[PDB]
Amino acid sequence: TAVFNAARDGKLRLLTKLLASKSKEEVSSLISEKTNGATPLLMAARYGHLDMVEFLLEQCSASIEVGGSVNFDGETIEGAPPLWAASAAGHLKVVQSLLNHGASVNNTTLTNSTPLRAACFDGHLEIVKYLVEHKADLEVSNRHGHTCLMISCYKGHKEIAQYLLEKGADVNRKSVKGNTALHDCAESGSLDIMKMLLMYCAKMEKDGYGMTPLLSASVTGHTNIVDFLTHHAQTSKTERINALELLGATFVDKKRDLLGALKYWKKAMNMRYSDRTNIISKPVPQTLIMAYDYAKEVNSAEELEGLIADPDEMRMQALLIRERILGPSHPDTSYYIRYRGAVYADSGNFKRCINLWKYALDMQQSNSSLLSFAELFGKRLLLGLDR
Structure with missing residues (x-):
């Protein structure tokens, strides 16, 4: 009653x-x-x-x-x-x-979330151990395939992640969208946890979007992960170049830091031309894009030094880089096309704004519904990152 x-x-x-x-x-x-x-x-x-x-x-x-x-x-x-x-x-x-x-x-x-998963979400180390000692199954994932190991690395809980690994948690589990615990470390910037997963020979793999943990870190902007992984032998020369160019674009659009963007673009341009036996030249898109003001990516160290006096050129380089590396189906591509159009609208350039928004709409319609204009104006359960 x-x-x-x-x-x-x-x-x-x-x-x-x-x-x-x-x-x-x-x-x-x-x-x-x-x-x-x-x-x-x-x-x-x-x-x-x-x-x-x-x-x-x-x-x-x-x-x-x-x-x-x-x-x-x-x-x-x-x-x-x-x-x-x-x-x-x-x-x-x-x-x-x-x-x-x-x-x-x-x-x-x-959501198929176990007691163990909820304890790992909020970091209750002493509940986690008691559950495991009372025969909790370390490998029961939620309905997205997200595990207790993945959520504890996503949240930065080093002691919990360490205990799960000591009790035998499978370090290479994949969720239904291809996410591994190395991706969760990359998204949260937990370098120390990422190193600990590598002590168990965790394999770097592409997830559903085709993202390696390295590229995922260049997307979310965690420079500690990108610096570490671009000196790791399991990432090829071409993956380093792209991860650094993508990180620079993230510096332009998410961090609004054009000096840091150039530092990463120069690092990448040097690797492209380091070995004169084997030039690693920029791929060429199918066509020039009116929404990008018909820009094309710089192709030499010299085209790079003029850019700092040209903030508008850097913003178009960032869009070219992101569409090339992430492609049209990655949500950040159309998101940052719209953001850049929004900045132009706020500065009076309504034509550039509209052409960018037209292009972002044609992109998603020829191929993450919480990034419409209406929903941005009016979240993690969709990704399976919930308790």
Whole structure:
């Protein structure tokens, strides 16, 4: 009835007032009642009321595996059992108690997120170890194929990632979109974790977008990952050049730092022309692009030194570089075409703005729906990066 708000907030004396003036068998169905999606035990465990939890189990352990709505960071998560909620929130003693009463360490939310995964999200090292020691399966992933190892590297949790690897987590797992734990390290800039995965011979692979961890780091702008990986023997000379040219474009468009962009473009131009036996010349696109003002990529160290006095030329180089390396189906390509058009509109160049926006629209229509104009004006559950 209202004994659901009782367990939700922890007052055990309020609850037991009704549990004495109750039935030895219909106290059962009062606690097994979904009040706004959640059982009373689900909310006692969500909010860490250890004594509320052990009293409710000693009455009736029927709701121990039933999941419902629970709230985290404002948003509501569905089908979450009590052990899961206790581990997302960090209540270790609750977790230890639910297991003592035979809760299933493997029962998941409807995204197929295990108790282990939720504990690794928020960094609860001491819950993670207890779950693993109570036979949690390290390799159960969510419905996108994202693992506990991937999420703990994406979040930067070095100690947790280290423990999972010591317990035998497969370092080369791939999600359904081809993401490996080395990609998550590249996206979060966790160089120290990336080095630790390489101690287990983690293989660098292209994901669905065709991104290696190196290219993923040049996209998100993590220069520590790019500097490390472009001196790693598992990346070829051509992949280094492209990663540095892509990183420069990211400097232009995301970091708004044209001096750092040139530093990376010069580094790349030198490697192209370092070995005079074998020139590595820029590929040639099928046609010149009106939205790019018909620019073409610089092809020599000399065309590079004039660019710093030409911010507009650098912005077109960045777009050429990004369309060449990432291609038309990568969301950042049309995103930064639109952003560059937006900057031109804000400076009065409505024709350049419109031609850029026309092109970005023709691009995505001849081939990530949270990057429309309407949605940018009005997020990670779409990518499977959620709890």
